């Protein structure tokens, strides 16, 4: 319950962001970092006795604040592209030498170049072929998200209405498109490996969860293409009897 | 019917 | 405070080993953590002071040793998944305390399985609606990359099916060109039925 | 000790606009009370506040029920707040006809 | 069958004097009440049976009930030292009397356990003459009770006045206290999102208590993670309970509802 | 400090609410405490009093209240319990460094003579085993108001029996005419 | 329990006494008084934080006795003896004293069965007397078919005293019982008075021809 | 048919390191043991049926049970601050596992409830996924166990290792774990006092537990008798009876779950 | 919290001088143990000290058992003392063949 | 079988 909000978000170059971290309950110590692959965490700051206790050396743009009821917020007045990739918050009772702090689910906020190139996904369920049907006794379903940028999609899966964690997997890094200069798209495939009998039965619906989380309507987008917001996309599948 | 041994703590 | 190993690999037959080095002043204190893929930072190993063979999680452990100024988180038998960016960190005492997880690029374990007589097989899969667009091997095949930005195939695949405890290290292939395992060393006994053009 | 409240909005004899019904906001187990409770009709407090016995249950926890003589309609927003000291924000319940 | 004078009290330091509330549950229904902020400052008899008894009975009801209301304030002047606080502790001191008779007229066994802060502070046992304090504080209370024949006086009260008054209540109850309204049952099928239905057996208005509903399917007790809440009254003293379960679409008829009551016909 | 209870003996029948008296005259904030001394036993306390409300509670059903108009506390009860035969005394604690924390006096005694159920006067004489020449006289079921060095009788003699809550108020006598100080009625079952 | 020891003692003129009071549990205040009919309590003494033993046990030593000055002594027990706190009291050390060792006399007992007259009342009456005892230490109880009873049992709070003499006498201190008439008609109803003396032991320099004055097991008989 | 790995610990402030003792009660009979002052520093297989198993699991049985014992010393570094003491608090922190399966082979319901100083500190519930802390302190523990999927891991362990291993022991136990030893009875007149006697029922050496022995067809139990569960020095349990009746008028319930 | 250490002296298979039998010294609930237990043969101690599992019961209370190899007779004083931290004086029990 | 999850307090 170290909940953070918003859980993914996107912002263009130079504005301030309002990112919230909510601790579980009565604690006092809050820590802030940046888990991007570049550089290191570097320990933004920790806050104590209603005062930021440990401070390093920053440009003036970095700042942070929490509330009396322990609610905590981040505010990055000026963005410098990559410097806003992924962020983490910590909570602990008193923050002593022999005690730890617990981290939240983070603020993964992979940033676009500009609002122009924010793109929706092209997805389709790929039916199992009779080759991996007839003798293997093991099906193979695939959803593929061609043409999304950046890596904000949170691919999950739905089985016959419900959700399970079995036979589904996805790599931690979607394969990038042609390198270009500073932008590309991604594919980030998924798999199903349910039993063959689980597939030939006509009564089984399967659909991917390519749902974008990370951008909302409060944007000044004006190009002819669709507004980049949190999009509700999906897929579809059904049985194939024999 | 109630009780009347008002117990001390 | 920085450890050399930025990438550690192991199969499902060997005890997990990683490196955790440190060099600070005063009395050091080490913390350990793990980053399961795109999730929180719940820890598995704590050290404060006292015993050498420090306790741990589901079977992880580490030991304190000035002779190497390091812990080297050890585990006699890693669990099935255990594939994440493990990292350890130290920071010196300050007024009130510092206790910062300054690790440095952690280390990513991968737990490639190898059991149950792998039976190679590669197939091409089609989709619904417009059918035109369309997409069990060994355990040592080195990771490779696409030669170009066309004829896309996949990245590393590791999965499991809970019902019969079996699994399928496999590969997908969504070709971009209208016209492919050239960088792969798939053996000759593959059940590959040549679904290339089709 | 600062134990957490509960919630329920179960209705009296099957709800039907033809006749009159009762709302029942019967909160289960508590700890130090400092309680304020009201029923919601499309928003805002009502004037039919009627509490009951502030008794206690086996697991050293209180309970409390509220009455009202009323008749609903198909287009209405009935609810019951629950407020306490353990929480920083109130809670609202849905009067769905199936519960 | 039972009659238990539930007591409760709360304290708000710096705002006057503590509050005390009491009730009574002859069988299960409530018949008596008390408060420290009311206007009648007497006993209020909401019951169709126990209403006509002599004016002395209602007038007194040990009107020293609001003397116990100050005895509790006296107690929370040493309970402030036991669980040592300064002055401001807003705290509750639950009390629970009770005598349980047999269906023929035997005393069966009586009950009394007290708690502080929702935590047990002293209790009786099966048989009597025993104290089981549950902290390093109420050990003093246990010894003090052991000193002056406390359990003996409790024995006297339980085997005397409580159980005799419960005989009198049962006689005065005629059939109002003992009529055993059974449940009436109804259910609806209705679906869930895409491929599921929710069977819900509904029973309402029954009395007395001690009915539980477990989900059945082909006769097996598959007590899955079903979400009930707690035992609730239907606005007069009657209680009702329902069921909830998730079943796959097309596969519902296997599931059945188990209905059993100590007073079931 | 001085505490006095002028009533050296209080007599209440089983139809009368109990009334006793307590007095004091001290300085500071006075605290008055009561106690009960059941015959040849402990000194249980039933009626405490420190400050606050006037009509202070008490165990069983006893109570009392404090009045400045008389500096009294007056342990009382609408209907005293059946036995209540003791030496109730009323004591006050004075202020002292660390606390002075029962200077009461002789207190008073209550006798709860019962009177119901058609008392039947009767005199009897009882003999013993072995040397049967020794014998004692006995009475039975006297009223509720009756108030040498040879042929003694008894002291005050009142009982309660728990079979049907009856009574056997009587008087033994150990060596007819021995009841010379008695005012036994003419309907006595004395058979001589 | 505020248990005492001994519950009954007798001593001659002059020497010291050892009386014990045992508190219930952890406590600091243990009082002392003298609940005699004469004079007043006087609030004898008490120690505050050893100013008794460390474990709160308390003993009394009265080096010199002045006859009646040792009648009945009591102890208390309380956490601190604060203004708003009370103290439990122990059952005391009732120790009614004799003049000298010479006139310490045992009790004479006689069970006085019901007469046939008390034939239609449906009520029996058995009587035990303790004729000629000194001092007043008797602990009269009753025994019914081997078991304790407290219904029909009674005893006057002050035994009637003998010829006044000057400073000594004997007492009778009778008790009687009122079991049902059918209770006494049955022959399997053995009763036995409990005139058992408490109050004196063998640590005495008694030398007269009469029996040694100690605690003694007297009894009675009935059927 | 149940299974429980009882844990316990104590503190010796200013005397070194805390202790740890653990046992196991597959069915009812004790089979496994551990200590923090023993010389073996290993599990002690003192049970007849569970002895043939391979040396590897006898060696381990998560030999990191010692690691758990060294984890408890870290736990009692914040349990001291919760119930705030200085350094010298000599306290016990008991642990209560338990994995009860159905007689056919189902999972029935698993159990766990921990406690501190004889007072409950946290507990599981029927079904699962719930915490019921019982003080101002362990509310932190309750909320944190809510935080990182704790009860889910407990579900994993219960639905896995409990049922698997326990069925393994029942397979290994053959008839030793399931033999249903019935009581043997004896009684005499036993005159007491002067006018009464005691009719004392006796039953010794039966297995398993849960015998019902209570006091012409009535239950007149209004006094104090019997101590507690009574072990006969091998695992077998026994109970007796007590009653007071008058001389000449002397005229017990016999119920066992395994009674013939 | 202290509980207080209830004990008993019940024996194994009916004691008889013809054969051998052990005495069991079981104990009910406990709080912080610091326990010292010995078996008495006509006073003093015995070299056959044999403890058992320091397990615990449902109501957060320990229990314990002991063994000893002997045969009894008609002239002997066997006992099992009780010692703890709550009590200031030890307790002794009689091994009679009726309990 | 034993359990390996060492629940931190």
GROMACS .gro file of N, CA and C in nm, chain H residues 55-169:
model
  345
 1283UNK      N    1   1.948  -3.898   0.337
 1283UNK     CA    2   2.026  -3.810   0.426
 1283UNK      C    3   2.019  -3.663   0.389
 1284UNK      N    4   1.990  -3.628   0.264
 1284UNK     CA    5   1.996  -3.488   0.224
 1284UNK      C    6   1.889  -3.405   0.294
 1285UNK      N    7   1.765  -3.453   0.296
 1285UNK     CA    8   1.658  -3.375   0.356
 1285UNK      C    9   1.664  -3.383   0.508
 1286UNK      N   10   1.709  -3.496   0.563
 1286UNK     CA   11   1.737  -3.498   0.706
 1286UNK      C   12   1.844  -3.396   0.744
 1287UNK      N   13   1.946  -3.380   0.660
 1287UNK     CA   14   2.049  -3.280   0.687
 1287UNK      C   15   1.989  -3.140   0.683
 1288UNK      N   16   1.913  -3.109   0.578
 1288UNK     CA   17   1.866  -2.971   0.564
 1288UNK      C   18   1.739  -2.946   0.645
 1289UNK      N   19   1.627  -3.005   0.604
 1289UNK     CA   20   1.494  -2.962   0.645
 1289UNK      C   21   1.490  -2.810   0.657
 1290UNK      N   22   1.542  -2.744   0.554
 1290UNK     CA   23   1.578  -2.602   0.562
 1290UNK      C   24   1.663  -2.576   0.687
 1291UNK      N   25   1.785  -2.631   0.683
 1291UNK     CA   26   1.886  -2.607   0.786
 1291UNK      C   27   1.900  -2.458   0.812
 1292UNK      N   28   1.853  -2.378   0.717
 1292UNK     CA   29   1.821  -2.238   0.741
 1292UNK      C   30   1.707  -2.220   0.840
 1293UNK      N   31   1.657  -2.327   0.902
 1293UNK     CA   32   1.583  -2.309   1.026
 1293UNK      C   33   1.669  -2.236   1.128
 1294UNK      N   34   1.800  -2.261   1.126
 1294UNK     CA   35   1.893  -2.179   1.203
 1294UNK      C   36   1.893  -2.035   1.155
 1295UNK      N   37   1.882  -2.014   1.023
 1295UNK     CA   38   1.871  -1.878   0.972
 1295UNK      C   39   1.744  -1.810   1.024
 1296UNK      N   40   1.635  -1.885   1.033
 1296UNK     CA   41   1.513  -1.832   1.093
 1296UNK      C   42   1.533  -1.797   1.240
 1297UNK      N   43   1.605  -1.882   1.313
 1297UNK     CA   44   1.637  -1.852   1.452
 1297UNK      C   45   1.720  -1.725   1.463
 1298UNK      N   46   1.807  -1.698   1.366
 1298UNK     CA   47   1.882  -1.573   1.362
 1298UNK      C   48   1.801  -1.458   1.303
 1299UNK      N   49   1.689  -1.487   1.238
 1299UNK     CA   50   1.597  -1.382   1.197
 1299UNK      C   51   1.513  -1.335   1.315
 1300UNK      N   52   1.480  -1.427   1.405
 1300UNK     CA   53   1.401  -1.389   1.522
 1300UNK      C   54   1.476  -1.293   1.612
 1301UNK      N   55   1.610  -1.302   1.617
 1301UNK     CA   56   1.686  -1.206   1.695
 1301UNK      C   57   1.674  -1.066   1.636
 1302UNK      N   58   1.659  -1.056   1.504
 1302UNK     CA   59   1.635  -0.926   1.442
 1302UNK      C   60   1.492  -0.880   1.464
 1303UNK      N   61   1.397  -0.975   1.469
 1303UNK     CA   62   1.259  -0.938   1.498
 1303UNK      C   63   1.248  -0.879   1.638
 1304UNK      N   64   1.317  -0.938   1.735
 1304UNK     CA   65   1.317  -0.885   1.871
 1304UNK      C   66   1.419  -0.773   1.883
 1305UNK      N   67   1.417  -0.682   1.787
 1305UNK     CA   68   1.493  -0.559   1.793
 1305UNK      C   69   1.400  -0.445   1.758
 1306UNK      N   70   1.285  -0.481   1.702
 1306UNK     CA   71   1.173  -0.391   1.685
 1306UNK      C   72   1.053  -0.430   1.769
 1307UNK      N   73   1.039  -0.558   1.805
 1307UNK     CA   74   0.938  -0.595   1.903
 1307UNK      C   75   0.970  -0.539   2.040
 1308UNK      N   76   1.095  -0.499   2.064
 1308UNK     CA   77   1.129  -0.429   2.187
 1308UNK      C   78   1.083  -0.284   2.184
 1309UNK      N   79   1.091  -0.220   2.067
 1309UNK     CA   80   1.044  -0.083   2.055
 1309UNK      C   81   0.894  -0.071   2.048
 1310UNK      N   82   0.826  -0.172   1.992
 1310UNK     CA   83   0.680  -0.170   1.984
 1310UNK      C   84   0.618  -0.167   2.123
 1311UNK      N   85   0.639  -0.273   2.201
 1311UNK     CA   86   0.610  -0.270   2.344
 1311UNK      C   87   0.734  -0.212   2.413
 1312UNK      N   88   0.740  -0.079   2.413
 1312UNK     CA   89   0.863  -0.007   2.445
 1312UNK      C   90   0.922  -0.049   2.579
 1313UNK      N   91   1.040  -0.110   2.573
 1313UNK     CA   92   1.120  -0.141   2.690
 1313UNK      C   93   1.259  -0.084   2.667
 1314UNK      N   94   1.354  -0.109   2.758
 1314UNK     CA   95   1.487  -0.049   2.740
 1314UNK      C   96   1.583  -0.145   2.669
 1315UNK      N   97   1.626  -0.251   2.738
 1315UNK     CA   98   1.704  -0.354   2.672
 1315UNK      C   99   1.678  -0.493   2.729
 1316UNK      N  100   1.620  -0.499   2.849
 1316UNK     CA  101   1.624  -0.619   2.931
 1316UNK      C  102   1.499  -0.705   2.920
 1317UNK      N  103   1.407  -0.671   2.830
 1317UNK     CA  104   1.284  -0.747   2.819
 1317UNK      C  105   1.306  -0.893   2.784
 1318UNK      N  106   1.285  -0.981   2.882
 1318UNK     CA  107   1.291  -1.124   2.860
 1318UNK      C  108   1.155  -1.170   2.811
 1319UNK      N  109   1.145  -1.202   2.682
 1319UNK     CA  110   1.016  -1.230   2.621
 1319UNK      C  111   1.026  -1.349   2.527
 1320UNK      N  112   0.911  -1.409   2.500
 1320UNK     CA  113   0.899  -1.522   2.410
 1320UNK      C  114   0.816  -1.482   2.289
 1321UNK      N  115   0.855  -1.533   2.172
 1321UNK     CA  116   0.789  -1.502   2.046
 1321UNK      C  117   0.755  -1.636   1.982
 1322UNK      N  118   0.636  -1.687   2.008
 1322UNK     CA  119   0.600  -1.818   1.958
 1322UNK      C  120   0.552  -1.810   1.813
 1323UNK      N  121   0.564  -1.922   1.743
 1323UNK     CA  122   0.520  -1.934   1.605
 1323UNK      C  123   0.433  -2.058   1.593
 1324UNK      N  124   0.330  -2.049   1.510
 1324UNK     CA  125   0.227  -2.152   1.498
 1324UNK      C  126   0.195  -2.172   1.350
 1325UNK      N  127   0.258  -2.273   1.290
 1325UNK     CA  128   0.220  -2.316   1.156
 1325UNK      C  129   0.102  -2.412   1.169
 1326UNK      N  130   0.073  -2.483   1.061
 1326UNK     CA  131  -0.029  -2.586   1.065
 1326UNK      C  132  -0.095  -2.605   0.931
 1327UNK      N  133  -0.108  -2.730   0.888
 1327UNK     CA  134  -0.156  -2.761   0.753
 1327UNK      C  135  -0.242  -2.886   0.766
 1328UNK      N  136  -0.372  -2.866   0.788
 1328UNK     CA  137  -0.465  -2.975   0.815
 1328UNK      C  138  -0.533  -3.015   0.685
 1329UNK      N  139  -0.522  -3.143   0.650
 1329UNK     CA  140  -0.580  -3.195   0.527
 1329UNK      C  141  -0.700  -3.281   0.562
 1330UNK      N  142  -0.787  -3.301   0.463
 1330UNK     CA  143  -0.902  -3.386   0.478
 1330UNK      C  144  -0.865  -3.532   0.472
 1331UNK      N  145  -0.950  -3.619   0.529
 1331UNK     CA  146  -0.917  -3.762   0.533
 1331UNK      C  147  -0.917  -3.828   0.397
 1332UNK      N  148  -0.978  -3.766   0.296
 1332UNK     CA  149  -0.972  -3.819   0.160
 1332UNK      C  150  -0.847  -3.774   0.085
 1333UNK      N  151  -0.795  -3.656   0.117
 1333UNK     CA  152  -0.678  -3.605   0.049
 1333UNK      C  153  -0.692  -3.461   0.004
 1334UNK      N  154  -0.797  -3.394   0.050
 1334UNK     CA  155  -0.818  -3.254   0.015
 1334UNK      C  156  -0.727  -3.166   0.100
 1335UNK      N  157  -0.747  -3.034   0.093
 1335UNK     CA  158  -0.667  -2.940   0.169
 1335UNK      C  159  -0.736  -2.890   0.295
 1336UNK      N  160  -0.868  -2.910   0.307
 1336UNK     CA  161  -0.944  -2.867   0.424
 1336UNK      C  162  -0.918  -2.720   0.455
 1337UNK      N  163  -0.831  -2.693   0.552
 1337UNK     CA  164  -0.795  -2.555   0.581
 1337UNK      C  165  -0.661  -2.551   0.652
 1338UNK      N  166  -0.574  -2.460   0.608
 1338UNK     CA  167  -0.449  -2.437   0.676
 1338UNK      C  168  -0.462  -2.337   0.790
 1339UNK      N  169  -0.363  -2.337   0.879
 1339UNK     CA  170  -0.370  -2.256   0.999
 1339UNK      C  171  -0.238  -2.186   1.024
 1340UNK      N  172  -0.247  -2.066   1.081
 1340UNK     CA  173  -0.131  -1.996   1.135
 1340UNK      C  174  -0.174  -1.880   1.223
 1341UNK      N  175  -0.115  -1.869   1.343
 1341UNK     CA  176  -0.140  -1.754   1.430
 1341UNK      C  177  -0.018  -1.737   1.520
 1342UNK      N  178   0.047  -1.622   1.509
 1342UNK     CA  179   0.164  -1.592   1.591
 1342UNK      C  180   0.124  -1.510   1.713
 1343UNK      N  181   0.208  -1.515   1.816
 1343UNK     CA  182   0.179  -1.444   1.940
 1343UNK      C  183   0.309  -1.401   2.006
 1344UNK      N  184   0.296  -1.306   2.099
 1344UNK     CA  185   0.410  -1.248   2.169
 1344UNK      C  186   0.374  -1.230   2.315
 1345UNK      N  187   0.460  -1.278   2.405
 1345UNK     CA  188   0.439  -1.268   2.549
 1345UNK      C  189   0.302  -1.321   2.589
 1346UNK      N  190   0.261  -1.431   2.526
 1346UNK     CA  191   0.132  -1.489   2.555
 1346UNK      C  192   0.014  -1.413   2.499
 1347UNK      N  193   0.039  -1.304   2.427
 1347UNK     CA  194  -0.066  -1.224   2.366
 1347UNK      C  195  -0.054  -1.234   2.215
 1348UNK      N  196  -0.168  -1.252   2.149
 1348UNK     CA  197  -0.168  -1.270   2.004
 1348UNK      C  198  -0.117  -1.144   1.935
 1349UNK      N  199  -0.023  -1.163   1.842
 1349UNK     CA  200   0.039  -1.053   1.769
 1349UNK      C  201  -0.007  -1.043   1.624
 1350UNK      N  202  -0.035  -1.156   1.560
 1350UNK     CA  203  -0.093  -1.157   1.426
 1350UNK      C  204  -0.145  -1.297   1.401
 1351UNK      N  205  -0.248  -1.307   1.317
 1351UNK     CA  206  -0.310  -1.436   1.294
 1351UNK      C  207  -0.369  -1.441   1.154
 1352UNK      N  208  -0.377  -1.562   1.099
 1352UNK     CA  209  -0.453  -1.585   0.978
 1352UNK      C  210  -0.600  -1.606   1.011
 1353UNK      N  211  -0.679  -1.636   0.909
 1353UNK     CA  212  -0.822  -1.655   0.925
 1353UNK      C  213  -0.868  -1.772   0.839
 1354UNK      N  214  -0.989  -1.819   0.867
 1354UNK     CA  215  -1.055  -1.913   0.778
 1354UNK      C  216  -1.069  -1.849   0.640
 1355UNK      N  217  -1.070  -1.933   0.537
 1355UNK     CA  218  -1.031  -1.890   0.403
 1355UNK      C  219  -0.888  -1.840   0.416
 1356UNK      N  220  -0.855  -1.725   0.358
 1356UNK     CA  221  -0.723  -1.665   0.373
 1356UNK      C  222  -0.722  -1.517   0.333
 1357UNK      N  223  -0.603  -1.459   0.322
 1357UNK     CA  224  -0.584  -1.320   0.280
 1357UNK      C  225  -0.650  -1.222   0.378
 1358UNK      N  226  -0.603  -1.224   0.502
 1358UNK     CA  227  -0.655  -1.135   0.604
 1358UNK      C  228  -0.561  -1.133   0.723
 1359UNK      N  229  -0.552  -1.017   0.789
 1359UNK     CA  230  -0.468  -0.997   0.907
 1359UNK      C  231  -0.551  -0.933   1.017
 1360UNK      N  232  -0.527  -0.975   1.141
 1360UNK     CA  233  -0.611  -0.940   1.256
 1360UNK      C  234  -0.526  -0.899   1.375
 1361UNK      N  235  -0.435  -0.803   1.354
 1361UNK     CA  236  -0.350  -0.754   1.461
 1361UNK      C  237  -0.433  -0.709   1.581
 1362UNK      N  238  -0.376  -0.727   1.700
 1362UNK     CA  239  -0.450  -0.709   1.825
 1362UNK      C  240  -0.374  -0.620   1.922
 1363UNK      N  241  -0.320  -0.509   1.872
 1363UNK     CA  242  -0.259  -0.407   1.957
 1363UNK      C  243  -0.234  -0.283   1.873
 1364UNK      N  244  -0.198  -0.174   1.940
 1364UNK     CA  245  -0.157  -0.054   1.868
 1364UNK      C  246  -0.027  -0.074   1.793
 1365UNK      N  247   0.051  -0.176   1.829
 1365UNK     CA  248   0.181  -0.199   1.765
 1365UNK      C  249   0.166  -0.277   1.635
 1366UNK      N  250   0.115  -0.400   1.643
 1366UNK     CA  251   0.115  -0.490   1.528
 1366UNK      C  252   0.020  -0.446   1.417
 1367UNK      N  253  -0.051  -0.334   1.432
 1367UNK     CA  254  -0.125  -0.281   1.318
 1367UNK      C  255  -0.030  -0.248   1.204
 1368UNK      N  256   0.091  -0.204   1.237
 1368UNK     CA  257   0.194  -0.183   1.136
 1368UNK      C  258   0.224  -0.314   1.064
 1369UNK      N  259   0.240  -0.422   1.140
 1369UNK     CA  260   0.269  -0.552   1.081
 1369UNK      C  261   0.154  -0.598   0.993
 1370UNK      N  262   0.030  -0.576   1.038
 1370UNK     CA  263  -0.086  -0.614   0.959
 1370UNK      C  264  -0.088  -0.541   0.826
 1371UNK      N  265  -0.071  -0.409   0.829
 1371UNK     CA  266  -0.076  -0.332   0.706
 1371UNK      C  267   0.040  -0.367   0.613
 1372UNK      N  268   0.157  -0.397   0.670
 1372UNK     CA  269   0.270  -0.429   0.585
 1372UNK      C  270   0.255  -0.567   0.522
 1373UNK      N  271   0.208  -0.665   0.599
 1373UNK     CA  272   0.176  -0.794   0.540
 1373UNK      C  273   0.069  -0.780   0.434
 1374UNK      N  274  -0.019  -0.681   0.448
 1374UNK     CA  275  -0.108  -0.647   0.338
 1374UNK      C  276  -0.029  -0.594   0.219
 1375UNK      N  277   0.079  -0.520   0.244
 1375UNK     CA  278   0.152  -0.454   0.136
 1375UNK      C  279   0.214  -0.552   0.036
 1376UNK      N  280   0.316  -0.628   0.077
 1376UNK     CA  281   0.381  -0.718  -0.018
 1376UNK      C  282   0.325  -0.861  -0.011
 1377UNK      N  283   0.208  -0.881  -0.071
 1377UNK     CA  284   0.154  -1.012  -0.109
 1377UNK      C  285   0.188  -1.124  -0.012
 1378UNK      N  286   0.182  -1.097   0.119
 1378UNK     CA  287   0.227  -1.196   0.216
 1378UNK      C  288   0.136  -1.318   0.217
 1379UNK      N  289   0.006  -1.297   0.234
 1379UNK     CA  290  -0.086  -1.409   0.242
 1379UNK      C  291  -0.089  -1.488   0.112
 1380UNK      N  292  -0.057  -1.424   0.000
 1380UNK     CA  293  -0.047  -1.499  -0.125
 1380UNK      C  294   0.067  -1.600  -0.120
 1381UNK      N  295   0.183  -1.559  -0.068
 1381UNK     CA  296   0.293  -1.653  -0.050
 1381UNK      C  297   0.255  -1.761   0.050
 1382UNK      N  298   0.182  -1.724   0.154
 1382UNK     CA  299   0.136  -1.826   0.247
 1382UNK      C  300   0.044  -1.926   0.178
 1383UNK      N  301  -0.043  -1.878   0.089
 1383UNK     CA  302  -0.128  -1.968   0.011
 1383UNK      C  303  -0.043  -2.063  -0.071
 1384UNK      N  304   0.062  -2.010  -0.134
 1384UNK     CA  305   0.149  -2.091  -0.217
 1384UNK      C  306   0.207  -2.203  -0.132
 1385UNK      N  307   0.262  -2.167  -0.016
 1385UNK     CA  308   0.325  -2.266   0.070
 1385UNK      C  309   0.224  -2.371   0.116
 1386UNK      N  310   0.105  -2.327   0.158
 1386UNK     CA  311   0.004  -2.417   0.211
 1386UNK      C  312  -0.044  -2.514   0.104
 1387UNK      N  313  -0.086  -2.462  -0.011
 1387UNK     CA  314  -0.134  -2.547  -0.119
 1387UNK      C  315  -0.023  -2.631  -0.181
 1388UNK      N  316   0.102  -2.600  -0.151
 1388UNK     CA  317   0.212  -2.682  -0.198
 1388UNK      C  318   0.267  -2.773  -0.090
 1389UNK      N  319   0.371  -2.723  -0.023
 1389UNK     CA  320   0.456  -2.808   0.060
 1389UNK      C  321   0.376  -2.880   0.167
 1390UNK      N  322   0.277  -2.813   0.227
 1390UNK     CA  323   0.198  -2.876   0.332
 1390UNK      C  324   0.136  -3.006   0.281
 1391UNK      N  325   0.051  -2.997   0.179
 1391UNK     CA  326  -0.020  -3.115   0.132
 1391UNK      C  327   0.078  -3.218   0.077
 1392UNK      N  328   0.178  -3.174   0.000
 1392UNK     CA  329   0.273  -3.269  -0.058
 1392UNK      C  330   0.346  -3.347   0.050
 1393UNK      N  331   0.418  -3.277   0.137
 1393UNK     CA  332   0.492  -3.343   0.242
 1393UNK      C  333   0.404  -3.425   0.334
 1394UNK      N  334   0.289  -3.370   0.373
 1394UNK     CA  335   0.203  -3.441   0.467
 1394UNK      C  336   0.152  -3.571   0.408
 1395UNK      N  337   0.108  -3.568   0.282
 1395UNK     CA  338   0.074  -3.694   0.218
 1395UNK      C  339   0.194  -3.787   0.211
 1396UNK      N  340   0.315  -3.733   0.195
 1396UNK     CA  341   0.433  -3.818   0.198
 1396UNK      C  342   0.448  -3.887   0.333
 1397UNK      N  343   0.426  -3.814   0.443
 1397UNK     CA  344   0.437  -3.879   0.574
 1397UNK      C  345   0.328  -3.982   0.596
   0.00000   0.00000   0.00000
